[PDB]
């Protein structure tokens, strides 16, 4: 009669990390990749012999910075002359070239100089997410919902669809990331009446606040605000500067000019930062950090909180701005939703909860997974083809 249909997938195509989910048996499964990771770096690396995508690309970035591409989402659907593009290029080790006022990333690959459009790099990330899903399902996947930031314009949305088409995916729909996070919590399934939802999204490099109104499952974006210069990497930077100073005090040596030592220090700092989200202290143990000196130290959560205190408080400025733009008072917000790994920081949670006078935060769905979760819920709804009974 009719053959069983393959599951459709939900993909959060993120700036730094991507995530894939599938809705089956009345629930969402966030799919881990073959290294056991529930999120995959949005990285693509090129060598004389291979093209590596995800963890394999990110794990070799230190010695191949010119040919390892990341942050393609910051270039997608933008003109080469866009001031955002020109400023971002100063921070990237890879080359960005101008092809008819459209940016392309230029690398050494398989013995040649090759240039790729941002949508081509994103299609490579999407191919890896499709393969992760097919490894779990055990059959080929065709249909997907892909998410984008609410502020993405028509060109940025079309270039994201183009990336999906290059990857061999049928793009069911491009949906906003804050809408997908709300769908993950079933905030569109609460019946008749208006609900005001605030999505608090703190990423690796940027911070976004969105206010949505939901009425009978219909979403309206009421306000967006944020800080392009606020993310998890800024907290890592504060720990880096702290430990560089500590090494100077303790050993009378400045390590800041040995890239390897700084890199090993930053890697340890990011892991210590994660431990501090569940523990009140964390150890830092690096063997032969600089001049054969072992660096064995610790940091309390209180000291880390003091180091990043101004940065954490600054997340409340875009919240107040979004509320003024939406013409709403904080008491009028019905639901608060957390998105991004950096939202696990207890102090960030406490500051926002205190701002909303003790209100509970929706954080039960892993914040680095909530967007893919909602995209998977939507993908299953979009492929339904029920014929009404008499
Ligand atoms: N448990 C956690 N506590 C604090 N931060 C975290 C945690 N987990 C993740 Br993931 N992060 C940070 O989220 C960002 C995602 O791009 C990176 O800066 C990660 O370091
Ligand atoms: Mg995100």
From Swiss-Prot:
Locate the residues binding ATP.
14-17, 73, 204-206, 270-277, 341-344
GO molecular-function terms, A-Z:
ATP binding; ATP hydrolysis activity; ATP-dependent protein disaggregase activity; ATP-dependent protein folding chaperone; C3HC4-type RING finger domain binding; cadherin binding; death receptor agonist activity; denatured protein binding
Q: Does the keyword Nucleotide-binding apply?
A: yes
Record PTM N6-acetyllysine, positions in chain:
79, 110, 248, 350
Q: Which subcellular locations apply to this protein?
A: Cytoplasm; Nucleus; Cytoplasm, Cytoskeleton, Microtubule organizing center, Centrosome; Secreted
Disease annotated for this entry: In certain aggressive cases of activated B cell-like diffuse large B-cell lymphoma (ABC-DLBCL), plays a role in the cytoplasmic sequestration of misfolded N-terminal mutated PRDM1 proteins, promotes their association with SYNV1/HRD1 and degradation through the SYNV1-proteasome pathway. HSPA1A inhibition restores PRDM1 nuclear localization and transcriptional activity in lymphoma cell lines and suppresses growth in xenografts.
What is the role of this chain?
Molecular chaperone implicated in a wide variety of cellular processes, including protection of the proteome from stress, folding and transport of newly synthesized polypeptides, activation of proteolysis of misfolded proteins and the formation and dissociation of protein complexes. Plays a pivotal role in the protein quality control system, ensuring the correct folding of proteins, the re-folding of misfolded proteins and controlling the targeting of proteins for subsequent degradation. This is achieved through cycles of ATP binding, ATP hydrolysis and ADP release, mediated by co-chaperones.
Put simply, this protein is called Heat shock 70 kDa protein 1A
Give the source species: Homo sapiens (Human)
């Amino acid at each position: 009669g009719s053959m069983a249909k393959a599951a459709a997938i939900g993909i959060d195509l993120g700036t730094t990390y991507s995530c894939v989910g599938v809705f089956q048996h009345g629930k969402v499964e966030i799919i881990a990749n073959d290294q056991g990771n529930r999120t995959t770096p949005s990285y693509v690396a090129f060598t004389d012999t291979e093209r590596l995508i995800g963890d394999a690309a990110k794990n070799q970035v230190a010695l191949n910075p010119q040919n390892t591409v990341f942050d393609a989402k910051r270039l997608i659907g933008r003109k080469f002359g866009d001031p955002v593009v020109q400023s971002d290029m100063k921070h990237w080790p890879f080359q960005v070239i101008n092809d008819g006022d459209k940016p392309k990333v230029q690398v050494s690959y398989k013995g040649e100089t090759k240039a790729f459009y941002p949508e081509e790099i994103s299609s490579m990330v999407l191919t890896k997410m499709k393969e992760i899903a097919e490894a779990y399902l055990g059959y080929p996947v065709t249909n997907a919902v892909i998410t984008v930031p609410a502020y993405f314009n028509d060109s940025q949305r079309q270039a994201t669809k183009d990336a999906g088409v290059i990857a061999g995916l049928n793009v069911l729909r491009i949906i906003n990331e804050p809408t997908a996070a709300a769908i993950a919590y079933g905030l569109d399934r609460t019946g008749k009446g208006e609900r005001n939802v605030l999505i608090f999204d703190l990423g690796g490099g940027t911070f976004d606040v969105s206010i949505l109104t939901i009425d009978d499952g219909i979403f309206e974006v009421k306000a967006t605000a944020g800080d392009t210069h606020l993310g998890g990497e800024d907290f890592d930077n504060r720990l880096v500067n702290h430990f560089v100073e500590e090494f100077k005090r303790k050993h009378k040596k400045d390590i800041s000019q040995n890239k390897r030592a700084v890199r090993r220090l930053r890697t340890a700092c990011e892991r210590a930062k994660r431990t501090l989200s569940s523990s009140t202290q964390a150890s830092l143990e690096i063997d032969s950090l600089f001049e054969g000196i072992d660096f064995y130290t610790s940091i309390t959560r209180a000291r880390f909180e003091e180091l990043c205190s101004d940065l954490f408080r600054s997340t409340l400025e875009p919240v107040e701005k979004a509320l003024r733009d939406a013409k709403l008072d904080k008491a009028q917000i019905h639901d608060l939703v957390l998105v991004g790994g950096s939202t696990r920081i207890p102090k960030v949670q406490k500051l926002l909860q205190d701002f909303f006078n003790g209100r509970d935060l929706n954080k039960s769905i892993n914040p680095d997974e909530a967007v893919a979760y909602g995209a998977a819920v939507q993908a299953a709804i979009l492929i339904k083809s029920t014929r009404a009974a008499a």
